Paper text:
Actinobacterial 2-hydroxyacyl-CoA lyase reversibly catalyzes the thiamine diphosphate-dependent cleavage of 2-hydroxyisobutyryl-CoA to formyl-CoA and acetone. pmc2-Hydroxyacyl-CoA lyase (HACL) enzymes belong to the thiamine diphosphate (ThDP)-dependent decarboxylase superfamily and catalyze the reversible cleavage of 2-hydroxyacyl-CoA thioesters to the corresponding carbonyl compound and formyl-CoA. AcHACL is the first published HACL crystal structure and forms a compact tetrameric assembly such as the OXC and ALS proteins. Interestingly, a unique feature of the actinobacterial 2-hydroxyacyl-CoA lyase is a large C-terminal lid domain that, together with active site residues L127 and I492, restricts substrate size to ≤C5 2-hydroxyacyl residues.
To gain insights into substrate 2-HIB-CoA binding, we have solved an AcHACL crystal structure in the presence of the inactive cofactor dzThDP to 1.55 Å resolution. Berthold et al. have already shown for OfOXC that the acyl-CoA substrate (2-HIB-CoA in AcHACL) can be trapped in the enzyme by replacing ThDP with dzThDP, an efficient inhibitor of ThDP-dependent enzymes. In AcHACL, the substrate 2-HIB-CoA mainly interacts through its CoA moiety resulting in multiple interactions with, e.g., residues Q255, R273, S274, R362, R417, K564, and D561 of one protein chain. The 2-HIB acyl residue, on the other hand, is well positioned in the active site by hydrogen bonds of its carbonyl (Cα) oxygen with atom N4′ of the cofactor and with the δ amino group of residue Q128 from the adjacent protein chain within the same dimer. This brings the Cα atom and the thiazolium C2 atom in catalytic proximity of about 3.3 Å. Furthermore, a central water molecule (W1) forms hydrogen bonds with the tertiary alcohol oxygen atom of 2-HIB as well as with active site amino acids H44, T88, and Q128. In the obtained AcHACL structure, all substrate-binding pockets of the tetramer are occupied with 2-HIB-CoA, indicating that the asymmetry between paired active sites observed in the pyruvate dehydrogenase E1 component or other ThDP-dependent enzymes is not found in AcHACL. A closer inspection revealed that substrate binding is suboptimal in the WT and the E493Q mutant, since one methyl group of the 2-HIB residue binds very close to the side chain of E493 (2.9 Å).
Numbering used by the authors:
A (entry chain B), C (entry chain B): 16 to 587
B (entry chain A): 15 to 588
The structure:
Amino acid sequence: RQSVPVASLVAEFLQEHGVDRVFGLQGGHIQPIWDQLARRGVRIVDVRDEGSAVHMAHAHTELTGQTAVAMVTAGPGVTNTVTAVANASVSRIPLLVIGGCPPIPQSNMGPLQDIPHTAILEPITRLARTLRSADQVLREFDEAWARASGDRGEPGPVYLEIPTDVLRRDVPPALQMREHLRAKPKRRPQPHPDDVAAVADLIRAAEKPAIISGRGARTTDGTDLVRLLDASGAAYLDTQESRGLVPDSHPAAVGSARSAVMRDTDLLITVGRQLDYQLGMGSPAVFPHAKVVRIADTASELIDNRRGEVEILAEPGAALAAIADALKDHTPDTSWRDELKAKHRKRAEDYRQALHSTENGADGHIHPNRIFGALDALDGDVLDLGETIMIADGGDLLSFGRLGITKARRYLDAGAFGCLGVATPFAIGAALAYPDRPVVAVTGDGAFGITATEIDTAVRHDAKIVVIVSNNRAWNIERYDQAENYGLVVGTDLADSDYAGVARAFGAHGERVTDPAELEGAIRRALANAPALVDVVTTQDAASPDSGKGLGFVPDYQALTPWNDAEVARRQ
Amino acid sequence: ARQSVPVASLVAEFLQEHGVDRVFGLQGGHIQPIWDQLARRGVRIVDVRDEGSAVHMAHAHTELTGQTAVAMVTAGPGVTNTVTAVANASVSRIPLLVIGGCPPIPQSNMGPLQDIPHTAILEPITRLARTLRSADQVLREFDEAWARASGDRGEPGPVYLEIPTDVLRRDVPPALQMREHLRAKPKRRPQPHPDDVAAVADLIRAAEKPAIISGRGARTTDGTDLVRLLDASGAAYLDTQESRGLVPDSHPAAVGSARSAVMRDTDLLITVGRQLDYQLGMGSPAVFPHAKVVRIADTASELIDNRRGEVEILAEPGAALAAIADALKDHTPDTSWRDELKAKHRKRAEDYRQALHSTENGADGHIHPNRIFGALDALDGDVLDLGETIMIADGGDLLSFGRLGITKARRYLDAGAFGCLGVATPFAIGAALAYPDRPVVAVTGDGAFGITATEIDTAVRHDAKIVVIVSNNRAWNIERYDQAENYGLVVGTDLADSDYAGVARAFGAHGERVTDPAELEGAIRRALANAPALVDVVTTQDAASPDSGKGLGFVPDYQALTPWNDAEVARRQE
Amino acid sequence: RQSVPVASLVAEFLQEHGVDRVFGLQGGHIQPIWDQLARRGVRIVDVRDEGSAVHMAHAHTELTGQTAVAMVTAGPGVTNTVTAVANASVSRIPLLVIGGCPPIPQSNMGPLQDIPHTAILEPITRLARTLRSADQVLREFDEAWARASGDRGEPGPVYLEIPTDVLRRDVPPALQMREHLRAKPKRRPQPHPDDVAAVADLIRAAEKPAIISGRGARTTDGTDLVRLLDASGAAYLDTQESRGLVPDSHPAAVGSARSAVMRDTDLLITVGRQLDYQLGMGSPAVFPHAKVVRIADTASELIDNRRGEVEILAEPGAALAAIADALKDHTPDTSWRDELKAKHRKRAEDYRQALHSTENGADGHIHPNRIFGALDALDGDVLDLGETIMIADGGDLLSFGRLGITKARRYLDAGAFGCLGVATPFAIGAALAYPDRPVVAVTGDGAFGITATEIDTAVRHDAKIVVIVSNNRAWNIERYDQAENYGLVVGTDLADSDYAGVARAFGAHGERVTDPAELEGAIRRALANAPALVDVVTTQDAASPDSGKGLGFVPDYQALTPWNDAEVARRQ
Ligand SMILES: CC(C)(O)C(=O)SCCNC(=O)CCNC(=O)[C@H](O)C(C)(C)COP(=O)(O)OP(=O)(O)OC[C@H]1O[C@@H](n2cnc3c(N)ncnc32)[C@H](O)[C@@H]1OP(=O)(O)O
Ligand SMILES: CC(C)(O)C(=O)SCCNC(=O)CCNC(=O)[C@H](O)C(C)(C)COP(=O)(O)OP(=O)(O)OC[C@H]1O[C@@H](n2cnc3c(N)ncnc32)[C@H](O)[C@@H]1OP(=O)(O)O
Ligand SMILES: CC(C)(O)C(=O)SCCNC(=O)CCNC(=O)[C@H](O)C(C)(C)COP(=O)(O)OP(=O)(O)OC[C@H]1O[C@@H](n2cnc3c(N)ncnc32)[C@H](O)[C@@H]1OP(=O)(O)O
Ligand SMILES: Cc1ncc(Cc2csc(CCOP(=O)(O)OP(=O)(O)O)c2C)c(N)n1
Ligand SMILES: Cc1ncc(Cc2csc(CCOP(=O)(O)OP(=O)(O)O)c2C)c(N)n1
Ligand SMILES: Cc1ncc(Cc2csc(CCOP(=O)(O)OP(=O)(O)O)c2C)c(N)n1
Ligand SMILES: [Mg+2]
Ligand SMILES: [Mg+2]
Ligand SMILES: [Mg+2]
Ligand SMILES: [Mg+2]
């Protein structure tokens, strides 16, 4: 080892920890790190807005399991990340944000961009620190890295900033410890056999077991989950954060029976999933017959809103496998699951076939479902949807996408946070992670306006993305709440913008579609010429399931009117 | 004769009664009940493409008009999209109100849609950040927050209020709806003490080289009491980016091209509503080696930072300036230093401005950005009146060129002490809607513009007559230059030759590209006749601004700029 | 100037700013400052509990107007101050707390006492900062000093901590600026004449004007207040934080007519006073006929709960004088004030005479009012109450003290915060500030147990205090709420402790009293042998006004039941 500046050690720490790319936007306060990353051969993915760099890192970690890294300058560079940090905090995604900050001698003196970055980010990070001791920077990086994984907290984003005088300070070789530089494996806490047995007993006693998966299950490959589904006879639901773990044809997979499963299950088993608003707070009002069991590698998916009759805090794969083993010699009663599955095959197949011929709305414009129809039609022709990373974003468009996107290798969207504008930055992170196939992002026009200029980033970095915009000239799920519940539509209209022209202005391939019969060709040409955008002139006359269920109205107790009605009855 | 009405109605009424005739924002369900009531009262709703831009619009509105402005945004990402623009308003000490959505009280901490700790995130960069849980007290909490935005119990700047949707829908009995909370209130007017006035006038009589440097608080005045004091004192005058336009260009004190000379030699620095932050070298003795210090302001945020006054006046600055002018009634100032600076300033500024019309292309064959400022100067008195124009600047090298190139504006806005890239378009929109009779002109770097470009759509939908001129140098170019000069490696600072005119046309604005500098005057003339409009100017990468040359990109240990930093290193080793 | 360590410059800053004493408790982290203060001849008043040192500083500043200083070590030394800091924050008293903290190299590494002091104190200070730049320490001290006065905030406590490696670092003489070392005068913002005139017009139109004073009025000597009372014909009330500004015999002084003044005034004028719970939130329910005017040098006494038809933000003395001037040629209608005053003379004189002969309670023990009787009886004999600093603390005892303490030069008590245990630390600060006369502190036994060991501090530092304890073997106002509103008395009894013996064990003079006829002699002997304690065996059968009005019960809208009943009527 030689005496080297902090900036060099930070670059080395990152590379040794497996970082081969940093998302970011250059400023002088971080230039010393930026320089060293480039001299080490770390790819720098420079963006148009720092928020998008954090979104890119989120997508990288969520897909790959490798903690990703954004780097931004002092002041507005850091404050531009707060939305993307909050989003990663809510979704419990490990990532590191490296911020610039002013030199120590000028503290509190009004130097350029001295705002309290750590104070702003502390409520939505696992750690937010200013590193004032050159000798201890390496250690602070390694500990923050562990905390992003969930050590001393739960998985999520961490923030570190180094005053520029500290960045430029030398660290003697004695203080450069191999144990802080080196990559570390994930923790693997194991289940206790008594908890495994107690869950197996609940499954044997249950007539209508159901498993709902989430983030922690999606860290596994799905094979132990399928083993437990096979041993238990349970129905299976996933969530936006856990798509793709169970084959569609599996006798447990009943994705179009969500209400039926929640209403009747006598044993809900959560697997790395929160019982947040997305699952009716786990309320007895939404699960009126369910006993509860909770399995996760973090108590963030064990203690919220409902407690387990058993709770297992362990690596989910090992827990699922141990319970499957313990159900040796059990013959599950699958008659409820099978009855749901028969109804699911009809409902899901009818729905998917209908996507190819959905009528135009009263305004003469394309129903957004035709986008999902056209993608389904191209599957096995010009793209393999089962190898494709699908992204969804927007309001009505996002809700239609939850039903319209059924074959994807992986799925990302606006998350529990409802973070509009993720579609383009997610698509870019996904595409650079998996360069062999186009990534397809389907987005509302409202959402797309937030991060549209990242089309520039996609072209400059050659990220093979296809963005498809539902251009309905509106924040349409909002326009509909205003009409239905208030009788006045105001400040929710947008214009008939040329998003293909926006894409072409930033060097991407672009095409506008007004005729639904043109969608397959337009998407074919977009796939062949990625990065590409398809601007689809869509109807305002089309209520998504979210629209119809009051999501826009914000009831007192639950996100949706039907669940809220059930909760009001439970209360009395 | 009051009746029982929901909180959402009272909030809309509170705002209209406090003089709010417009609200910038982006609709979500959590704020819809307020949004609805604002529209039924006839308050204009200016709906944007990104909530950060709504807060920048409110900032511009307040900074120009002095009327506290309002942004309204939904829970979760709607609130977190504001943080940059809130920080910017906090650093610049601009009163504004952000009204955020938030989940109903029953669902607190349960993982409802968008339950993040908005108030904890915003508390470090607001004067007040609160969740309002008592229907009966919402009016009161609004009135108090409004007063704290003005600087009561703190200093001027942004405040944040959020009302859980169940509270928004709750009725308030009429007896709890107090006129005193609904009604508009006047600004405070603390007055100077005559002993402090006398003491300042004594310092001015004893000084040979008095200099006044203005800031935010001065810019809240019309400039006429400032001119009275300049006249009575014989002081030299500098402004800052936040105080342009208070003193006529031809005034014998106005020596804007003599910044280093004034700071090096003044024996009496008088700050008027101005911080001695990095923009004035921390007020360091290293940068003001001969100055005694006097500070005048209506807030100690412009009295106590880095240097203390031999006298500090905490008062409405207009009254303080007038009182000191009166106290100098029989003083005959020695103006010979000011006069010698002014004579040299006249020539240096005139030569500089003339040379803007003919600046040569850089080695890459592209337009020098100074030609944009030349073209605007040439059109003055032809198709636009720069003295009635609101000018905005944003970017890196472009912004530094703009500080020399923009000399005749009625009002000036830019990226601020925060160095907040992307303000150009949202500022221009707020400015144009405040002052609808003439185009607003925003000159921006391509880097900065990419942050808020989609707000061109907002300008077209709301008919904001803006002209945006882009220095398209295919780069974050002040950064590219720091990389080359101090590190020998240029990486992740290049952008592309994007069609910003095409982006503007895609959103229904007028757009044209300029590659030939002789085409600039026409392109800007056509842009002014067809606003909202963008002019995409292919500019050179071979052009170092004064900020570029002075190390701004490098971030020295003690001062923002190398020359000032060198002076501070010398001061330390005495 | 020479190159000197930060610790020396801090000692010099304090002495130059007028600090001639520092209250505190030594630890290694602050020893370098402690050492330099002692070498400069600054008196070190070392205490038994760091909280008491902050209370002492509070009393010094509140009495003298000079900002006072406590100094405490890292970790538990700082955390022991939080109550006394909160108390000073609520009362808006300028003070500086200097905390120790660990050296910079060991940050976040679990060094001895690395807890987040600044994060803990930030919600209840005007400034809380860690000073990491030796060169800028002087400047940070001067700015924090200004912020304690109210600059950029409102008057109250500030916290500064210097890592011990920074304390030991030299500062070059060039960076030691006279302007940061030197003492600074208080600000004096002046009224605008239009606001003065508008207030004078409201006074001319009012039939029943009333002035209520507070903290900001008590920063003046009272003479401009009396000028305005004379020019306006207003009734006058003070509050616990504004006693002693208006002579008792003044025709406006109607201290026993509090409810009558609030009920009928048609013009309430606050003078440096909050309309907090102590004045019924300024509610129309408590002031049903009042227009409102607010005068103060801080908007902390202008904007809370009621807005002024006029609000003057100025030095209160100048504002009061300007309004008195503007009432040149006004003949005030004093008939309401005079009618209140005639009733006041009878009520107050009857009450004060009755203090000399209050009966023992049913349990055979002294009524606490006899303490106030005995003090009244000694006035003009062995002490001059009009030159005496009186302190009150406790529950029932505190409430009886508000009526029983009527002649004092100055009065301190538990404050709006209701901070039990202030009595002894306040008495010590007061006594060292004004060494020529004994200070008398009257306290409940509950309150006294919190800070009793500071009797040791009083003896070691020769603070001439007399503490008189109402020893009723109870948190008695709490015992009474439990009996009246819950029917069960539990965990509110104390024991028949020997507080005279406690005092004698720490080297003070002590005496126990069981016979009310012994009180005058015991208090005479205590005054002659200060520091001294008188342990008065008092009754549990004695409801104070606070007890009778529900203070213990915490109603929904107001601190007291009658005010709360009025608010409930106003709401409907
Ligand atoms: C408040 C506001 C407007 O300002 C916002 O900020 S909103 C933020 C933007 N939007 C969001 O982030 C979305 C938030 N909401 C949601 O995530 C969802 O409403 C929910 C998770 C809370 C509830 O979703 P569901 O459990 O209903 O899941 P979906 O996948 O949406 O399924 C809807 C229905 O289609 C069914 N379905 C699913 N896949 C299908 C398929 N393939 N074929 C046919 N039907 C299918 C499904 O069973 C179900 O019908 P049913 O069983 O209730 O009768
Ligand atoms: C760190 C990083 C890069 O990552 C960032 O985030 S930077 C953020 C974006 N940039 C900014 O926000 C800029 C921040 N810096 C500044 O604001 C300024 O550098 C400063 C306030 C610190 C210094 O500005 P000056 O006091 O030098 O003022 P300017 O108006 O720029 O004047 C520069 C020179 O032009 C002169 N000048 C002004 N008007 C003139 C005129 N009309 N004609 C000729 N010369 C003129 C002026 O006198 C002076 O020359 P001199 O006296 O020093 O020799
Ligand atoms: C909640 C709990 C129990 O856990 C706690 O923590 S309590 C904390 C400990 N206690 C406190 O900090 C006290 C808090 N409360 C108070 O400060 C008071 O209740 C109050 C400020 C809110 C209200 O006080 P008042 O305005 O009633 O003032 P007092 O000086 O107490 O006067 C009481 C009465 O005696 C009268 N009075 C005053 N001086 C007199 C005199 N000299 N002679 C005769 N009567 C006199 C006075 O007029 C009034 O009677 P009326 O007009 O209402 O009929
Ligand atoms: C940053 C932010 N601001 C506001 C909102 C609130 C919202 C949730 S859904 C929606 C409408 C989205 O319109 P889009 O055109 O994308 O989709 P569509 O319904 O098909 O027309 C809004 C405004 C959220 N969640 N995030
Ligand atoms: C949100 C944010 N992120 C980064 C930065 C740091 C910066 C300051 S100046 C600059 C270059 C701006 O490039 P532009 O193209 O607008 O101008 P020009 O130099 O003429 O090419 C950067 C990146 C700031 N202040 N704010
Ligand atoms: C630190 C703290 N803990 C509890 C309380 C709550 C309280 C307010 S009054 C009171 C009883 C005081 O008993 P004392 O014996 O002093 O007075 P007396 O009624 O005459 O017997 C308590 C416990 C407060 N305010 N502060
Ligand atoms: Mg839309
Ligand atoms: Mg943003
Ligand atoms: Mg550029
Ligand atoms: Mg007691």
